[PDB]
Ligand binder design. Sequence first.
Ligand SMILES: O=C(O)c1cccnc1C(=O)O
Ligand code: SF4
Ligand SMILES: [Cl-]
Ligand code: NA
Ligand code: NA
Length: 299
Amino acid sequence: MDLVEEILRLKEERNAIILAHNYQLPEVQDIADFIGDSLELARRATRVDADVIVFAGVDFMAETAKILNPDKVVLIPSREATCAMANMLKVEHILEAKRKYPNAPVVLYVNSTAEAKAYADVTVTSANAVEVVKKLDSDVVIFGPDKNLAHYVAKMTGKKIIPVPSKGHCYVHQKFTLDDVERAKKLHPNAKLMIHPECIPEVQEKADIIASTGGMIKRACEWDEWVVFTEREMVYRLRKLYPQKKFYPAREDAFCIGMKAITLKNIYESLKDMKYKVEVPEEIARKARKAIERMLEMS
Ligand SMILES: O=C(O)c1cccnc1C(=O)O
Ligand code: SF4
Ligand SMILES: [Cl-]
Ligand code: NA
Ligand code: NA
C-alpha cells in the first residue's frame, strides 16, 4: 500500500500526530506515533505540540483529548468508534447516587461521556483506580461505569463502593469465564495468566497477575510465556514489544467492535478531509477537565 506513505505525508504537512489505543488493529498500530492505554493516552495528550491530533480510539477517548487540547484540532476517523461500556452510564444515575450518598465523591472511568464526566469529582482508568480511590478522604465512593472494576477497587481499597449504574460492564472482558481459565491451563501448561481488572471477580481470582494493559507491559518481563485475558489486539501489542516472549489470547472472539471501527483507510480519509472534528460544549468541557486534571495530578 502506498496508503501508508500517503498517511505519513499528510500527517507531516498537517502538523498532525496519530495517537492510538492498544486495542487498535495491527495496521493502525504500525502507523501510530504513540500507542498506549487510556491513562497513557491522557498523559500524552498533555504534551502535544502538534497542531492536529488524529485519535485512533473510541469517541469518548478523543473527547478527552479535546478537553485537554481545546485550542487544537482533534479528529476521530469514524464517529461509530464508540465504547459500549461508557454509554451505559447516564447523568441521572449519577444525580441519584449523589442524592443518596451526599458526601461521596464521584469517580468515573475516563472513557465516560463528557456529560457524565462533568459530574465527576475525579476520573480514573484501570491503571490508577486503586491509587486514586485510596487517596480520597471519604470511606464511601460512587464509582462507574464498570462494576467489575468497582469490585476490584473495593477489594484493594477496603472502601465502600457504590457502582453506577448497576449493570455497567465491558462486554469484551465480561466474555471470559472460569472455563476459559481451565482451557488456558490445559492448552498452555507452562504459561502464566495476565488478567485485566475488568474481568469478572471469579476470573480475576485465577490470575497470576491482575493489571491494566499498561501494567501488563511492565510485568511481562517476569515470565517468558503468557496467556492474556483482555482484548485481542493487546496480544499483537505485546508480541511486537517483546518478540522474544510468547503470548496467547485467552479467547480469539474477545475483540472490541468499537475499537475496530478505525482502519488504515479511514485514517487516510481523516487526514485527507480533516474529519471528523471532535467538539465538546464549553460548559461540559470545563467541568470534565477539572476531574481529568485531578486524575493526572493524583496518579
Ligand atoms: O485503556 C483502558 O483504560 C481500557 C482498559 C480496558 C478496556 N478498555 C479500555 C479503554 O480505554 O477503552
Ligand atoms: S474494550 Fe470494553 S471498555 Fe474499552 S472500549 Fe471496547 S467496550 Fe469500551
Ligand atoms: Cl488498561
Ligand atoms: Na487499556
Ligand atoms: Na489505563
